[PDB]
Amino acid sequence: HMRYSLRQDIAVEPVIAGWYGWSYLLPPQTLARFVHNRFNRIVESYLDDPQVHAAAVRQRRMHGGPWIHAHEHRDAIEAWYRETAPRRERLDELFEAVRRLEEDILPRHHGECLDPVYQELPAALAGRVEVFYGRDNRTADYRFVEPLMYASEYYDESWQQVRFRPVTEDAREFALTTPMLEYGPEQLLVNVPLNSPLLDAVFRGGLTGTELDDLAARFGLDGERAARFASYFEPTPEEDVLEYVGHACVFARHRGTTFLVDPVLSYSGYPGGAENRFTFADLPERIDHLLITHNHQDHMLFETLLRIRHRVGRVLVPKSTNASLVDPGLGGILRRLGFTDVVEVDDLETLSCGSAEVVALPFLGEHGDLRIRSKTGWLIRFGERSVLFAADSTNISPTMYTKVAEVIGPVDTVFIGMESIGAAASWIYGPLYGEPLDRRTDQSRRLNGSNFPQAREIVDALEPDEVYVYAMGLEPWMGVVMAVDYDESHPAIVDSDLLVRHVQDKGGTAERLHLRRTLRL
Amino acid sequence: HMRYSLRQDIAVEPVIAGWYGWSYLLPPQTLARFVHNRFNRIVESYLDDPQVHAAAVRQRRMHGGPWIHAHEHRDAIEAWYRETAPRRERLDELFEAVRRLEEDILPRHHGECLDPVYQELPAALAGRVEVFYGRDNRTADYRFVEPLMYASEYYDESWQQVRFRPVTEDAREFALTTPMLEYGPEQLLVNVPLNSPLLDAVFRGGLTGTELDDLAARFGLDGERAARFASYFEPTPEEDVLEYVGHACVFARHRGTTFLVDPVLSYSGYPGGAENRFTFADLPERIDHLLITHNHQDHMLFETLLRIRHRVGRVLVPKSTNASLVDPGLGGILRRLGFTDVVEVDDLETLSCGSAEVVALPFLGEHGDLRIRSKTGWLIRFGERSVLFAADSTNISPTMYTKVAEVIGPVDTVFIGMESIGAAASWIYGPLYGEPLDRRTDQSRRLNGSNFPQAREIVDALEPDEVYVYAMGLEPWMGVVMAVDYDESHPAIVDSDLLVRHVQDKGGTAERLHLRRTLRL
Ligand SMILES: [Fe+3]
Ligand SMILES: [Fe+3]
Ligand SMILES: [Fe+3]
Ligand SMILES: [Fe+3]
Ligand SMILES: [K+]
């Protein structure tokens, strides 16, 4: 009996409360802030004049701004907006409760026992927060008891969906500001929790035709919708490597153990695409260790994560207990996505992984000076050979990498990002703030990685033989999550050219990676 | 050939920079605060008038205050104080650097990019801190990069010792405020890192006479000192349990797997002691899982921990990344003590342990409203039977245990502390503050556990059949670390009597435990 698997050219996009899914949309407290302060404003702006959004989207320099890219579908958006009104109002109860805690309850205390705060808590937060004083012993603060927030009614799995659609080209349009509706007859929007075993059945494949119908039924699909689901399937078709796959994503194998860092893959089975890409079909059966450096949209892509989930053994992430709006727990987020073996690792702790050893390295900067602990570089020692994936690590704190080198010893290879001009922090995180900063102050708070002198100092402290600049946002499929417009005048490109020369002139190898590349190890 | 092991009546007391060893003395940044703000003041006060300390120590109600109990040994103390002056001055460089960061550098910023802070850091802190803004986006704060602090010169293992001495009775004198010197010819003070494998050789024992001499030599001992060491040794002499051992310490075995929570043991081999105590000699060969609820002096006793270390498989502790002076990393502290398999667990995460499952439960309160995340209750499910060790958990946040019960399901047995009148927070933590609170405000900040209504609500939310009140500080050997003076008028005792009745009157079993007790499971 014939067996079928998901086509390689069909993307399954994640959806949370109508929007393309990413980390900060899963915890209810942070969803509530984004809905209230960002998403409702984008929709209401659109429904008051669709032509402004049309005019912005018509221009590539505006891509990544607060614009609905599906501007021709006013009625669908309007109906979607009115049907979900009770979900917005439930969530606004959590929004208001946090506001009340922050503005009306906590600032009334000045160093005395905080027991009376708990007796005054809004119902949405009762039993689900902890309060305490900061370092001055007088200014009250709080954090969330995160798993009780996920157990609350404000975390609602029925608001989660996926949208199936074909992929017809390498480039992807910016997706984070457009409601995720079934805009065309080729697309299918299905109600399903992002952690569902049903999604695993989909991605694992190997199903008979009748099994596919059982699966379609468990998804509540019938009729032409079930036939469309079926049409997304087609008859089903070990020594060392290090492979640069794209942006910050690198694949390795060592003595049979596999590793994938900051995962982002592209698709295949459509004509006209670039050649020699590392796509989903190139993945091995098992990904023993998945490593994530930090919680930025371009390093943890839900769409990629859900598709590879069924192959993954263990996930490694940086450790945080902040349990705040700017820094929700990454491990908790990954477990809500259905990853069941997640390990958090602190500064300079070591963990053995197959035949290799992984060490977490400090990662400072690139987070707009927010109190965010969820970031690290990963050093992997593959026997005698050690590789650092530094992602967007900076050298804003001079001497740290010298101090780190004194503990970790020598490193042979360094992948380092050089996105030296980054977005304003308020663009990514502003909806989470209690109130805005004044505008000129806000402008100084950016999400910058290493420029040339910063990278130079890191490489000099660590003394690798090979240095690759990566994580530059050049691959067209990264357009889902960032603006991908490139020229060799860009300060970032110039600064990477300097770094590459610097390293060449010291006797090492160096290169800014552009597209897939097989490598030493 | 005859073999020898450490006598049961010989205690090996930990010493850090001259003082009895406990958690907050190991990280250099917190040692520096305690030395500068507490210990130097106690010594200088003593050396100006020994008779005040004599007069305080003469009275039991004062025990636990800032008093040197070895008051008759003025010259030894004076010489010790003058010989260690260069260690105090090295440490004062770290003290001053932190002060400068907190008072002069950080308050100059008001929301703008913090990069220039790093360029101004004192040398002691360069490369070893991270700065960032709090929730208001304008008030700057910081934390330590903890392993770089341990790699710095301010963390100095040569300042660590142990002191061997006989134990001749159950009661122990309060030890935390008296320099740990060789006050008598029966005592031996040895320079050795607290994490040394040499200490493991000592505690494991089974050594021949000549092996003991090799060991004495590796400790740098010769002559009469080596003979005194030798005299501390004597010829060397599996179904389910739950055993209350003392204060908050409970031992369990389940399907062969062993568990020890909040370890504190007493000694034996001396006449006149209470009968039927669970002492070091009663330990099994292996302690598979060691669990610590929180980082208070009466729940993590270095003296007990070092002695059992060689038997321990894995340590479980609450998770924190605060990396602050009030909340240094517990896991980092345990690894510096030589424990090599330590796992940190967050709110409501589960871990399988032998045949049982452990779940961490939220623990709020009893920490003076400080930002301290290093605290949890432990739920162990031993097959069908589940036991909660709640330690000093409170119910200051109404509804939390109801919300927790909705996630964890039913619990059969609860051990709960009821130390409802606790010390002032500034007594334990005050040396770590940047400056004092005004005195009347400070008085409201206490380290209280559950009183009667608080315990009642917890038991009511969780519905156990057995409830034991524990962790009451009644055992005489807890005098090392707290004042042990008891009467049935004490509000704490009365409130526990009410709780015990309440539970009896609902059909369950209940008891305040006093001394060792074998139990159900
Ligand atoms: Fe980033
Ligand atoms: Fe990035
Ligand atoms: Fe306590
Ligand atoms: Fe206690
Ligand atoms: K829920």
Ligand SMILES: [K+]
């Ligand atoms: K050191």
